[PDB]
Amino acid sequence: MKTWPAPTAPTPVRATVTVPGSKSQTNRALVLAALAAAQGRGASTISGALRSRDTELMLDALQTLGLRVDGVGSELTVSGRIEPGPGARVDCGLAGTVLRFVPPLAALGSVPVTFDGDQQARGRPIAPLLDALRELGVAVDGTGLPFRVRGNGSLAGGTVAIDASASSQFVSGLLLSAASFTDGLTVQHTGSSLPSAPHIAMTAAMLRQAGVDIDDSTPNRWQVRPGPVAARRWDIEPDLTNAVAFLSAAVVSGGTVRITGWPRVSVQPADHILAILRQLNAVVIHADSSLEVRGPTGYDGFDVDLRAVGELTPSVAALAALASPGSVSRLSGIAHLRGHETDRLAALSTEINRLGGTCRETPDGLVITATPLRPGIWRAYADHRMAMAGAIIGLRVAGVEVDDIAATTKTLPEFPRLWAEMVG
Ligand SMILES: C=C(O[C@@H]1CC(C(=O)O)=C[C@@H](OP(=O)(O)O)[C@H]1O)C(=O)O
Question: Which residues bind 3-phosphoshikimate?
Answer without folding.
Answer: 23-24, 28, 167-169, 196, 311, 340
